[PDB]
Amino acid sequence: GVLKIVKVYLAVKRRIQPGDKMAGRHGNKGVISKINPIEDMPYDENGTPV
């Protein structure tokens, strides 16, 4: 009953954003609540942000 099939493959890039789950390997899941700026994250004595 069909003549021809056309399949179109869309590819999207999903960036991380507040809302989607991130986990570890030890059953510690969580949902991102804020994407904090670089200068607002804690830093050590060498200035490297966390």
Partner: protein, 218 residues
């Protein structure tokens, strides 16, 4: 109240350097250091790759016969390119390369008002004896991080996320200063780490100019 001045700029490496501000009153070293650190990390102006046009490439989810890397990896390597255009605020570099070997950033036929500060920066590897890449890399000047999914056309021009921020790491220390007859005077050592496309002195001057212009509300 005394005032601080840029007394020393120790350019230890090609990228990361230290500037020194002295003398500073007690309790002002931390204030100035943290304000300058936040302004440098947030609001410095730089140049970044924004649009790329490879010759026979339609989308970034494809490959080119001859190169060892996907077009996505080439786009990421171009995203990590350090360039110091001087007069304009938008330029188009043209990379042409053929033959087996790496394609470093030195293979960019850059103009007079363009400076590639890391010529050893690899982009992609050509693995075929007759395989050539001819790409148009659009470098433009901006501020902060502006992803390609928020800006604003043919099926050839690929968009890369642009990170116009020359500084990568900023740290600061405060330590007692050497004055002839005085104590409780601090000295601020700002140890910054750019990618090479900015001057530490003009970085500090821009940060202070931005801070003063914000304070000009009152």
């Amino acid at each position: 109240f005394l005032k601080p001045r840029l007394v020393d700029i120790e350019q230890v490496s090609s990228t990361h350097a230290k500037v020194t501000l002295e003398p500073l009153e007690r309790g002002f070293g931390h204030t100035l250091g943290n304000a300058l650190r936040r302004i440098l990390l947030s609001s410095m102006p730089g140049c970044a790759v924004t649009e790329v046009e490879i010759d026979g490439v339609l989308h970034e989810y494809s490959t080119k016969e001859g190169v060892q890397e996907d077009i996505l990896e080439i786009l990421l390597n171009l995203k990590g390119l350090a360039v110091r255009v001087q007069g304009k605020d938008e330029v188009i570099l043209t990379l042409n390369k053929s033959g087996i070997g790496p394609v470093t950033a030195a293979d960019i036929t850059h103009d007079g008002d363009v400076e590639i500060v890391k010529p050893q920066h690899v982009i992609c590897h050509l693995t075929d004896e007759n395989a050539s890449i001819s790409m148009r890399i659009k470098v433009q000047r901006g501020r902060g991080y502006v992803p390609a999914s928020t800006r604003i056309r043919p099926i050839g021009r690929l968009l890369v996320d642009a990170c116009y921020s020359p500084v990568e790491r900023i740290a600061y220390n405060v330590e007692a200063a050497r004055v002839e007859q005085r104590t409780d005077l601090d000295k601020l050592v700002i140890e910054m780490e750019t990618n090479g496309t900015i001057d530490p002195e003009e970085a500090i001057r821009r940060a202070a100019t931005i801070l003063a212009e914000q304070l000009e509300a009152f």
